[PDB]
Symmetry: D2
Subunit: 498 residues, 4 copies
């Protein structure tokens, strides 16, 4: 015997030992007489159009591939449940939270960011940690990361940021000039760059890292009272990281280390779990916060805003077909049931648009009809119709305009959004010159210890040394702005590379 992942086919056969293999058919259900030899006129004669077995199979093979995710292309999935353990009904009326012990099925997808479908799991990169809750009030997608923060605080910078990470448009190589030119010109990135080049930049698989919603969200209770919140889901397996040496080895030795580790853990009954927490910030406290509390480069200090337990996320089922159940998984931040709403975070506001938009491209207009995407715990009833690959009854003969006198679906006032007041000029407000260094200094000096600071500066120097000197100089000036010794440490390492 090997690992469970290695014995996938052996176990499939054993489960089906007395199955009596199925008859091999065309897509049209016609049985096939011989799928090993093409139809020709004589043994050394030409192939015929009449070989509809060959073209049925080859035309489908020719169409197997769909566009990979524009980002987080490389990933691993599992299914399980969310279990409420504690009462947050004073903050949120959302059905998902409504009583202790209540279970909601989830889907989870873990990923890297920059690498395309064939890249390695054990590389330095943020990790996607996306959770789909199939609630009675529809799907709630909490599209999280293994960091509470990000590199930028306006969505207009996002395409550029990703371009700067991904391949040179001429050469198709990774380009340290592109990476550090962008980061040196945009020092709001200093906080997450500091997280990224620390030890938690290369987690030991998906089970040994935390998840965060990252953004400020809004919770609304049964009285229509709102608070702002952050979602934290902490690993029950504990934080564990790979050394740059071990990460490098696994990169060529098992590019799919993360996939394999998650599958085997679930197959052997070593089910991974996380505790979901919220931080709560009053509208009054949001006015007094010394930063923009909607700035994605900032955390809420735990001292001032302690973690409040909510429940348990448990992954206890592997995918049966990876393409159907994982590759086709679509998470939309805009999928929020009553009791959960967006904040004015400029990055989050951008995501409300981007995810359903890319899903209509990558998957198709009717992507929400793919079974893993279906809000299967809710009754979908509305005035939407048709589109390519329309899958179910398309809501039959139901009146397709609103309003109508013919008893078709009706809106539900209790689901109305929470009323928040705004005043100001309609303008592109500059956010570039908000505090870029303060929280990063507390991380560098207080959170990490000496050996972590040393590895951090070695990790950055190791990559930054490949950029031109003028980029190296601008970068070091940013690290110096957080703390003189953070800068001078990097600069000394840079000096003996150059």
């Amino acid at each position: 015997n090997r690992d469970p992942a290695s014995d996938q086919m052996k176990h499939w056969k054993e489960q089906r030992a007395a199955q009596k293999p199925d008859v091999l058919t065309t897509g049209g259900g016609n049985p096939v007489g011989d799928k090993l030899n093409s139809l020709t006129v004589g043994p050394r004669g030409p192939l015929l159009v009449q070989d509809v077995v060959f073209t049925d199979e080859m035309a489908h093979f020719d169409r197997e591939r769909i566009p990979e995710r524009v980002v987080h292309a490389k990933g691993a999935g599992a299914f399980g449940y969310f279990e409420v353990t504690h009462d947050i009904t004073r903050y949120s009326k959302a059905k998902v939270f409504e009583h202790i012990g209540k279970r909601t099925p989830i889907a989870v997808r873990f990923s890297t960011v920059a690498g395309e479908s064939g890249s390695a799991d054990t590389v330095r990169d943020p990790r996607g940690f996306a959770v789909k809750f199939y609630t009675e009030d529809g799907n709630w997608d909490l599209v999280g990361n293994n960091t509470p923060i990000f590199f930028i605080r306006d969505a207009l910078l996002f395409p550029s940021f990703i371009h700067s990470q991904k391949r040179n448009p001429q050469t198709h190589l990774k380009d340290p000039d592109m990476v550090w030119d962008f980061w040196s010109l945009r020092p709001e990135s200093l906080h997450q760059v500091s997280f990224l080049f620390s030890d938690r930049g290369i987690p030991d698989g998906h089970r040994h890292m935390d998840g965060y919603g990252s953004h400020t969200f809004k919770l609304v209770n049964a009285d229509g009272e709102a608070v702002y919140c952050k979602f934290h889901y902490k690993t029950d397996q504990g934080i564990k990281n790979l050394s740059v040496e071990d990460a490098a080895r696994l990169a060529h030795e098992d590019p799919d280390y993360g996939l394999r580790d998650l599958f085997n853990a679930i197959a052997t009954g070593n089910y991974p779990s996380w505790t979901l927490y919220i931080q709560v910030m009053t509208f009054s406290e949001a006015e007094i916060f010394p930063f923009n509390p909607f700035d994605l480069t900032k955390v809420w200090p735990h001292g001032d805003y302690p973690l409040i337990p909510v429940g348990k996320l448990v992954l206890n089922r592997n995918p049966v077909n990876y393409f159907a159940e994982v590759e086709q998984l679509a998470f939309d931040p805009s999928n929020m049931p009553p009791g959960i709403e967006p904040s004015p975070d400029k990055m989050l506001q951008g995501r409300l648009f981007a995810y359903p938009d890319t899903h209509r491209h990558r998957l198709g207009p009717n992507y929400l009809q793919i079974p893993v995407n279906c809000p299967y715990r809710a009754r979908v009833a509305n005035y939407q119709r048709d589109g390519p690959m329309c899958m179910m009854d398309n809501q039959g003969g139901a009146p397709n305009y609103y309003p109508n006198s013919f008893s078709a679906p009706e809106h539900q006032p209790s689901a109305l959004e929470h009323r928040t007041h705004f005043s100001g000029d309609v303008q592109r407000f500059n956010s570039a010159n908000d505090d870029n260094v303060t929280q990063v200094r507390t991380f560098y000096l207080k959170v990490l210890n000496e050996e972590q600071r040393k590895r951090l500066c070695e990790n950055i120097a190791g990559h930054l040394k490949d950029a031109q000197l003028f980029i190296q100089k601008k970068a070091v000036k940013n690290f110096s702005d957080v703390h003189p010794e953070y800068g001078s440490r990097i600069q000394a390492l840079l000096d003996k590379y150059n």
Copy 2:
């Protein structure tokens, strides 16, 4: 009360009188608070990206339309059954025929040819009569027409023929120069042009016309003995046609006359039926036939090849959602179960390719997973995987290569194609100068009577008069080649138009 079609919504509501309307949701299953008013900052303020109710609905509205059929875009559908009444098991082992009284569910789509989705039902044109049989051995699509013959006998002419019927590439108008230049240069078209401009060119709805497979097909019995066949399905309601005057009136008065007539007939229990017949031609008789028995411009004379009854086609169910169940219907001539095979008919050989190819474009790579297209009476099991909008389990964890040692699906030798011998040069053989006039003369002189001949020549002159004189002259020469008086009749009518 009105007609049943007119009371569609009234009956939907009455059926749902005590329904308790559904809650209106987003595609993601989230309930909607107010779907009549957009989210703005103040009553006369700008629209927000945060209005995910608006963009969910509008993005789907923006994607409602799919490409219309390249031909037969305008159509009507119904469902019912095929019932075997007579034994043809000496000719075909196909499960669909296997015992008297055996029922197979069918889908039917009726159509015009040239008109796009918004065109009129009661125009002069051939009619599509496509029948999908959901058999235990997969789907059998008999993609028929209301004529036993066609305009051409090689598929290389088909795109040109259709272009010549459809709009001028600059003007976007119907173009009599294009119509008659093609037909005058390709006199193999004389037979079906003669059928088309007769009274049966404008049927009174879909229920008062016959269906034909048109092509020669092959039937194979349980002994591996083959014969050639033709499929005929004759209306139990009787042949009935609209006068050019009545067809013209209904064109602006009810462009959807055919849709309305079929729906109302089924809704009132006036279920339309056809008797399915075969003609049988031995391989020996195929050698002695005075024409190419695979030439789509030719019939098998009933005298020499009498109709052999098979069973009954009955339409007893309307579509519930037209887009899902009709617009998305996909018929592939290549869908043939064991016991039914193609002939060497050059036109049919072309269709084996064209239909699955256009369906992968119009509908999508996984179009056979659309419920109305599913071979739902067969177990589909094979080595095909993935592709866009992959709908079911994608055959789970089943071994995805053949051959394999892991008990995945196996081919079934009894399904092997019938062995036929061919000898010759691989060449583009000229079929243009086969007999173009003989069977057309017997139609003009023997099948039609005097008043039918007169209307026929009036119908042609009425349209041909708009072509340039040199086209008129070439056309008349072809009609003269079938019979001098067929030509001179047209030419006299032409003379007093010009």
Copy 3:
């Protein structure tokens, strides 16, 4: 000789009188030996896969069709120029207006609304009148209609409204219950319904109707001073309408009457023109307007806001290929150069999203690279890359992230949008019960004469007669709310139908 449109092929032939027809090739540029006869093994043998001439041609034929526009599917196009005749530079700094005599190339598409690509030109429906200005500051799309108003004033009603105007989802038939249920429940539609059932409901082709921007827009001058405006383009050929009897006859006699009329006018040098006017309203005037000045169901009365001449629209060029140049035309209201900006009109805000969104579906991600859609009179330079059917150099090796230190394109502060102040709650504010009757009363009593009132009420009664009595009753109540005699006139006509 016939009309110029009829002689399209004749003229094309003559114009290459030197001849030497081109060599017939595959898409790959390989010359074709015989495209009239398929490659078979012997003359009555099977078709070979080796016939790559057949597959190349048939596969392209199989893919000819793209989704038709979700609305305004049925249309006519022509090209020409815009010429400035008056100085409006005190209102708008837009380069398009910057000096008298300045010419800008334009593209124009005329259409109906509800009908599909095969429907008739001469039906009762609003008419699209979309104008693309190819300016030095990029494309300006003025996506106008032959009416200054519309049926609804919130984009969330738009898909519903269009659903109600198109086919029953089960029957696929036009449904007077759907039409009048929606209109009777939404009496904001009374104004444009009154415009629609008046004489200007069926214009005599596209040359004899006016165009309107319809929406309030914003004009911004070189001093950053803003005003609100409305665009009017009045026909220089004069208003002319078809009687319902004449329109009905042309429906079946020439479904493409509009296409034919526009092509022939331009072909014979009878170039149609329009005079472009603006109305101007101050921010202060907007605060005092007795209605919402951004409500699409209202006009600015000419007495209070007189037309200000700007310039001339001239169509002097027919399309050469209709699919490439017209079917593929894409107008985005969001295409606005500096000097022209959106107003808070709920409907316009909706359209800023919908058109680029539907274009990415109907045409493709890179639709703006289709030559007729290309802003060919501007330099397109940005950080956008790749996508399906990327057709130009994809901006070559240019740095693909912003900001950068490598000389890639730079934002231009003079292009910054005009700053306006807003205060309010984020809420769905109800606009259903704004004034629905006042301006409609003045239209019925002042603008129309007796004979026009009578035809108006006949035109409504003639359609509304087929709706259920409860819908007839509610509709009549709304017409009664505008004026008792408008209601009683319709009710008397209805009474002798029922």
Copy 4:
């Protein structure tokens, strides 16, 4: 200074040293005032739909990705010329060969087979070596590999074979059970498996490997005399391979080693070249060949069929934009000019269908209009029209049906394919049990030396060790069938792994 590839941005900047960077615009050509800050109501307010700069950019970003190639996803491209050096006009009339010194522009793409777009260059796998010749008789695509043979000889095994080489459908991991189960069941793979696990399994970049057409093709001269041929293009830089240890290190150290090496060679003027040879075999020689001369698992021995020089392939131009020029490159084996034709090779016949088919999916219906795919050195003239993303005049107002009387393009009889005779039954003829061992014995014993045999058996044992024992046993039996010591060598290595 670094390598030229590293300095791509630096060089781009310098080359426009005059500066005046372009104005940043939307896709619509509208200039952008600030693309760094989103449009909000106040600085901590919500994002507006009015921010059409954000939506234009983000919607294009959302649509960057297209499906990767179903095989050979990971690749490098360059451009140059083909120069004729010898007269082969006695064998082929193809314009490409017609006189010595004649130059043809070429495009070339190198690739691995199984890996996705993010996988490493320096892995064991065959290498694609595809060459596009832009000839006056259209494009000639010679879609070759770095091997003269392949693993299978019938196209019906191809999707299965590729499935077996890629990821487990449940696990998404490489699966040695899938690899060796398929290879052990299909011993026709022994020859190319022997080539693959030899030293030439991991070439030192793309410049140090040979190209082969692999298939038997047909050459036809001006007299209509045909011969069978094989194309060989031998590296002028010499064969050079990476050790498994070195290839392993470069896998994680530079996953893009191949891309980097080709770009740098061309950038520094070290242009790589290949010498094109043919082998020629008579129709009479084909009848006497001791194997099937069309069997893709066999070579023509050089002793019996010596290489005949033809000309020189030179790569002297790097891509400027990789997505536009390389990712979008499409090679169709069916692109063959007069003088070059397919043989009855079952595998080649399969490829005549598969490539245009996958290109219509991956790229679009009109992929041949993508500039790098355009047969720009030929006039494309035919009766093909329309389709999505139609980019040129769509052949303007040219008559669109054939035949026509209006001077549209004409077929050219000199282009007619060569006529060959076939006799036989239409059947699926078994090719599984053709000689699987003879030529592989000569390769193992004659072509390789002792040290090479030892590395070969180490390379196989090193992979096969992870397959189940029953698969190990069947594989060893096949290697034993070629020579007992080939088998026992592998079995000894296997024994000390197990």
